[PDB]
Design a binder for this molecule. Structure first.
Ligand SMILES: NC(=O)c1ccc[n+]([C@@H]2O[C@H](COP(=O)([O-])OP(=O)(O)OC[C@H]3O[C@@H](n4cnc5c(N)ncnc54)[C@H](OP(=O)(O)O)[C@@H]3O)[C@@H](O)[C@H]2O)c1
Ligand SMILES: NC(=O)c1ccc[n+]([C@@H]2O[C@H](COP(=O)([O-])OP(=O)(O)OC[C@H]3O[C@@H](n4cnc5c(N)ncnc54)[C@H](OP(=O)(O)O)[C@@H]3O)[C@@H](O)[C@H]2O)c1
Ligand SMILES: COc1ccc(Cn2nnc(O)c2C(=O)Nc2cccc(C(F)(F)F)c2)cc1
Ligand SMILES: COc1ccc(Cn2nnc(O)c2C(=O)Nc2cccc(C(F)(F)F)c2)cc1
Lengths: 314, 314
């Protein structure tokens, strides 16, 4: 099943998340994306940052070439990284991603983050003390260059990621705006359910796409170990026994019933196949209200290293 | 016990809250304020808004005159209401409060709220449609007039209420500042524990004073009846059984042990006397961590009707 976007295109409502940390050998991205397509995923989320577009692209091409799917069946997303916000760098960045993935177009191209960083060869440019150097860019001129990538046919739709309400309206109030963002991809899960931002996006016809919907990978470089584990929540567990499903399936189904497009990362064959069961069952209105009550405005991303940035989203 | 303010004065760490809704006869404010002092409260929180300074001042005068306390034993607070923010109105507002209470000085005078309103005869001046008429006032000039009240001896200390971090820094960075705010009185409780604002206040030697620390009076005009009842929270009930106290006493001790000065409203003779039991027991470090985990960013006051004010604090 799909949702219609505000530019006419369609986005599958369950997406496969492809990020894995550097400890995971790069060959795994090829194997698991193939397994994701075989299991039923049609929405595939990647990025320049993830250092896996070559392998994710190869998996998509193989499933087209072996005759399982057609290119028009697959919805592939990439993202413009934050050292490429200056508008003359936007289209070269996208053409680079296409060359690495061996695709002619991406279905969706996002501004990865509102926090511009210094242009250069390094992905996370730092000074002598490991402090990350910021760049001052008007994101409305980044958006202009993004719109040109749409008109060029290199991206079917364009959107944003990690933008707050204030940063969204800075784009919606751009003089001469040609294309609204079709979506805003942000952290979203029952401990941080974004109800206020979701209603705002609904009011402007912008899809909210949830990442870390299963509670994140709890990587210690960015996630505090002492934070509570979402998939161990007692309410999620109670509902998992009730419906004879799992806590992950409850968390995924919660998002679908509130109009949120949901991503799910797994590099485990059996869990990949399990996650497509989300279309098989249904939560009652009372179940939904009990999940609603778990909201704590707890975001797992320790972004506090970067609150200095003028465009810090939190 | 008391905490030392950054101006050398001292503030008792447990305060009595005097606000009652209009349906409560004004005579009760006199009666319960005498009961609070008799039970041991020495810090008394009132305001122009509350329409009770006459009865509360009379209660304090009665307990001095009958020999129970001296004036120097009582710490009395009033607040400058939002329609008197213009500097020429500030001292006359304090003089009027002192006349109504028949006191020679207040121990503490606060800017009640950063949201300036149109001067006039109504607490909340409204126009033809029902929208409350705002006012545009440099709050730095309001503070200068507050400083002249301390110089005259009409207020021993001065402070603010319902300020966020940015509004505090605008005062702290003011050129020619003579007196920092001694405190910021804000909504604070286990569902909205203000840890970040607390740390900032500690870093500047400003005391955080907690209101609605028992979960508010759940007035239907301001508080959604669907929000959770703080005093029925299962975690607070369990800690209450361990220490052989009550949920309210757990919530009040929680604040004292993190360096927060805590207010407690009660118009019931037994509950007024119970609340001074906070000095009788302690919470373990593990107890404090379990209360810390309740934080939800839930503020009970439905202030969204005022979200359009330039100085909206949320
Ligand atoms: N725009 C952004 O800034 C941003 C930020 C973060 C993430 N994202 C995107 O969102 C995707 C997913 O978000 P995430 O990476 O935070 O991970 P996630 O989707 O929150 O899921 C995280 C963990 O859940 C486990 N899991 C998956 N299915 C499960 C199941 N059925 N039962 C139990 N455990 C299960 C996985 O471990 P196993 O792999 O061992 O199953 C995975 O490590 C990322 O891959 C990336 O594409 C975007
Ligand atoms: N600066 C501001 O803008 C602002 C805003 C709100 C409040 N305040 C100040 O802070 C004060 C208190 O905050 P609040 O008015 O929100 O009320 P609160 O202190 O959160 O207490 C709320 C309720 O707790 C009940 N209670 C008291 N002791 C109890 C006990 N031991 N066991 C069980 N229930 C108990 C009282 O009901 P009974 O009366 O039936 O005991 C009271 O209605 C106010 O009176 C006012 O002075 C300031
Ligand atoms: C639970 O929160 C998490 C956030 C990130 C990750 C790692 N990660 N995985 N996939 C991705 O796209 C990313 C990633 O770094 N995003 C990002 C990049 C720059 C700035 C920001 C923000 F605006 F949020 F500050 C976010 C894992 C979990
Ligand atoms: C739980 O939250 C509650 C807040 C207020 C009340 C009623 N109340 N009782 N004593 C008081 O001083 C007040 C009061 O209206 N304060 C106030 C006035 C103007 C603006 C603001 C703020 F800046 F917060 F929006 C606060 C009850 C509950």
């Amino acid at each position: 099943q799909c949702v219609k976007l505000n530019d006419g295109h369609f986005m599958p409502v369950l997406g496969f998340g492809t990020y894995a940390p550097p400890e995971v050998p790069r060959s795994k991205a090829l194997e698991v994306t193939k397994l994701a397509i075989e299991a039923g995923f049609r929405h595939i989320d990647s990025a320049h940052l993830y250092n896996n577009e070559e392998q994710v692209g190869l998996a998509i091409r193989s499933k087209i070439a072996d005759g399982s799917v057609k290119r028009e069946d697959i919805f592939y997303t990439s993202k413009l990284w934050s050292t490429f916000h200056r508008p003359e760098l936007v289209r070269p960045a996208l053409e680079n991603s296409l060359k690495k993935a061996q695709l002619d177009y991406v279905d969706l191209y996002l501004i990865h983050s509102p926090m511009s960083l210094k242009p250069g060869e390094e992905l996370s440019p730092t000074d002598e003390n490991g402090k990350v150097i910021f760049d001052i860019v008007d994101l409305c001129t980044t958006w202009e260059a993004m719109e040109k990538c749409k008109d060029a046919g290199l991206a079917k739709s364009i959107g944003v990621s990690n933008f707050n309400r204030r940063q969204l309206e800075m784009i919606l109030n751009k003089p001469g705006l040609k294309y609204k963002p079709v979506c805003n991809q942000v952290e979203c899960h029952p401990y941080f359910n974004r109800s206020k931002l979701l209603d705002f996006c609904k009011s402007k016809d912008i899809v909210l796409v949830a990442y870390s919907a299963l509670g994140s990978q709890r990587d210690k470089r960015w996630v505090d170990p002492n934070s509570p584990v979402l998939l161990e929540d007692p309410v999620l567990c109670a509902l998992a026994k009730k419906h004879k499903r799992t806590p992950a399936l409850i968390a995924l189904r919660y998002q679908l019933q509130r109009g949120v497009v949901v991503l799910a990362k797994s590099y485990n064959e059996q869990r990949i196949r399990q996650n497509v069961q989300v279309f098989e069952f249904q939560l009652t209105a009372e179940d939904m209200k009990a999940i609603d009550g778990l909201d704590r405005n707890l975001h797992y991303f320790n972004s506090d290293s970067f609150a200095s940035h003028p465009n810090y989203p939190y």
